[PDB]
């Protein structure tokens, strides 16, 4: 049986991997998931990738498949939401609003970076810059990035140590104890948090669309609830 192939967003790692052990179970079709930043898994797609699911961690890499004509707006819908946390290592004393200027900066220390997903193309990366700079932090932060490939990259800067602060997904914070959240910004710094899952325009596995409708499903639901993903 040729596993449906799914490339998610790296928040989506534990849940993904929970998702596709699930859907193999109830159908007996293996799922395979790929992880990478949002971004990455796109441009992989863009690029010939044979993904037959794409689940982002943004509209936007979606809308950029899907204006590459490799998904139909028709196989493409919202499944997740998130929330954005500002983390710090497990053990971290920091005590940080976000929203009180120059707070996030000062948290960093003398030399600490702000562990973020690349801002530019990382999903959590585009949402934490968008909320920073929604909050007035961008500037005081900007030139002190930890920019990582992906959102658990970051987390795992944080998680490490190896960063005083991180933003990540507040699933991301779930599924790493050794993190801990220090804040979660307001829902109105980014633009929502939203995962939608499309199967691909050129997938040709008999299961693509199966796969992505069991998604759908109560037991499929409850793993991303469960990981504290909002279902929508
Ligand atoms: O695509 Mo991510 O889950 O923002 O690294």
């Known amino acids: 049986t040729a596993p449906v192939t799914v490339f998610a967003a790296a928040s989506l790692k534990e849940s993904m991997d929970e998702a596709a052990t699930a859907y193999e179970k109830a159908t007996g079709t293996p799922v395979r998931v790929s992880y990478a930043a949002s971004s990455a898994l796109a441009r992989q797609i863009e690029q010939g990738a044979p993904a037959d699911v794409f689940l982002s961690a943004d509209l936007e890499w979606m809308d950029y498949l899907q204006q590459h004509g490799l998904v139909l707006p028709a196989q493409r819908h919202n499944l997740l939401g998130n929330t954005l946390v500002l983390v710090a290592p ?23 970076r702000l562990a973020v997903g690349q801002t530019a193309s990382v999903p959590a990366g585009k949402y934490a810059a968008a909320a920073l700079r929604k909050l007035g932090q961008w500037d005081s932060v900007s030139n002190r990035l930890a920019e990582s490939e992906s959102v658990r990259a970051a987390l795992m800067l944080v998680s490490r140590g190896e960063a005083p602060l991180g933003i990540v997904y507040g699933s991301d914070a779930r599924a790493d104890a050794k993190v801990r959240v220090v804040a979660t910004f307001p829902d109105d710094s980014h633009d929502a948090i939203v995962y939608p899952v499309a199967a691909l325009k050129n997938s040709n596995n008999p299961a693509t669309a199966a796969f992505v409708s069991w998604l759908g ?13 909002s279902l929508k």
Not at 90 to 112: H, Q, T, W
């Open 217 to 229: 499903s109560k037991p499929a639901k409850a793993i991303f609830a469960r990981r504290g993903f």
């Open 90 to 112: 497990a053990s971290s004393k920091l005590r940080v609003d976000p929203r009180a200027p120059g707070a996030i900066a000062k948290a960093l220390g003398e030399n600490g």
